[PDB]
């Protein structure tokens, strides 16, 4: 259960001029990375989708949607805006036990066809990291790919803690 | 005594076609900057600075320019008022610009979450000056756009001196 | 304006003198001492390379002047590596102590840019050609604006010549 370290902040680029009404939409799931994200062969990583709807108050309603055990799941989460624009916070962190903290930060988007971002979450004590790579269709080039395993490898992952979800059409679409 | 390159007229400068003005709202950079009386200075180079368009309830725009000068933030506060066509504007309380007769704001080409093109024309003292904006949401844009912008400007009769990229800064603008 | 060093202008990777010969059409040049002749701007003229059996390339220069088609003759020895030249018998150049010749980019099928510097007089002259296999490029224009710039040229010394149909084909 060790794991490898959350990096410090300062190794987490911040969109320059986060525009909160640009990325609001549905974002597939095309890259996933972090320190308890593991690559399996035998069962590998479905896509998911996460959507973004900006609320009159600016925080965000994010419904993450997954096919698992031959059904849709859905978790429906608040982010609050944080401290500089772009980065994010929980809602009712409360009602989620264990969990005693939840950042977001996006790395870096064009809005309309990509982007990255970080999450960190402090849960049963435990420092949990990832980096999703979001594209607004299930495909992205090479060299976005390429990018997002660089900068995932800059933050102390190795290749195994790096997966690219298979693409399927059931719950996502 | 003033010598001024000619304003273009009016139909060698495009429009952006359905103009959505919720959209361009927000903080632009201006990452470009060319004009009948814009002048590159190496000695003294142009500091970058950003103008905020925010929609107002009757659809006029409440324009900020923030810049950083002798030590300090300043800010200049105007209203552009829509005009004939989505896209265009006139300023408001013009009478209160001394010299100032005139006054136009026409959108060129925008994506809205990236980049920007503006182009303004003013007659002041009976002078016609006229500038263009690259405005971005970074404070960088890639060769493509600035040479795009180059060419425009150049499209509109002003030489590489009169086209300068304002040096990005952190003070005011952040 | 001073030669830049030679550490800001690239060569070539791996050059290929085989696929670099034939005809390249000059569209776009500068240099320290090629100025912007407004008034009547400058005729595009044609570069011939000839791989000979020794690997030095026979090099013609074509131009239209004084209604007639002129040929310039020169020899290109291979250099210290490959994508550099130097000039052939230099010492029937009178004045001339050095000619350095850099490939600094080339797809081989479509353009090339080329870097190359004399000492003359004991001045240190430069320039750079844009070479297209046609007449006309695309972007490779600004590309070799902006490598011109890199080198300290401003725009009055970086020229494009008009396309013409007599000698050059
Ligand atoms: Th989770
Ligand atoms: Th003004
Ligand atoms: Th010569």
Same mark, same amino acid.
């Given at each position: 259960?060790?794991?490898? /370290?959350?990096?410090?902040? +300062?190794?987490?680029?911040?969109?320059?001029?986060?525009?909160?009404?640009? =990325?609001?939409?549905?974002?597939?799931?095309?890259?996933?990375?972090?320190?308890?994200?593991?690559?399996?062969?035998?069962?590998?990583?479905?896509?998911?989708?996460?959507? %973004?709807?900006?609320? *009159?108050?600016? !925080?965000?309603?994010?419904? +993450?949607?997954?096919?698992?055990?031959?059904? &849709?799941?859905?978790?429906? $989460?608040?982010?609050? /805006?944080?401290?500089?624009?772009?980065?994010?916070?929980?809602?009712?962190?409360? !009602?989620?036990?264990?969990?005693? !903290?939840?950042?977001? $930060?996006?790395?870096?988007?064009?809005?309309?066809?990509?982007?990255?971002?970080?999450?960190?979450?402090?849960?049963?004590? $435990? *420092? %949990?990291?990832?980096?999703?790579?979001?594209?607004?269709?299930?495909?992205?080039?090479?060299?976005?790919?390429?990018?997002?395993? $660089?900068?995932?490898?800059?933050?102390?992952?190795? *290749?195994?803690?790096?997966? =690219?979800?298979?693409?399927?059409?059931? &719950?996502?679409?």
């Amino acid at each position: 259960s060790d794991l490898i /370290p959350a990096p410090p902040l +300062s190794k987490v680029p911040l969109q320059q001029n986060f525009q909160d009404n640009q =990325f609001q939409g549905k974002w597939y799931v095309v890259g996933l990375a972090g320190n308890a994200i593991l690559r399996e062969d035998k069962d590998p990583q479905k896509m998911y989708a996460t959507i %973004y709807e900006l609320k *009159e108050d600016k !925080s965000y309603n994010v419904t +993450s949607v997954l096919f698992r055990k031959k059904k &849709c799941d859905y978790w429906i $989460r608040t982010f609050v /805006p944080g401290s500089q624009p772009g980065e994010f916070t929980l809602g009712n962190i409360k !009602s989620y036990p264990g969990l005693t !903290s939840y950042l977001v $930060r996006v790395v870096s988007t064009n809005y309309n066809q990509h982007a990255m971002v970080f999450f960190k979450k402090v849960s049963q004590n $435990r *420092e %949990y990291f990832k980096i999703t790579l979001y594209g607004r269709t299930k495909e992205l080039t090479s060299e976005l790919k390429e990018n997002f395993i $660089r900068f995932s490898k800059s933050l102390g992952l190795p *290749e195994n803690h790096i997966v =690219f979800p298979v693409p399927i059409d059931q &719950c996502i679409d």
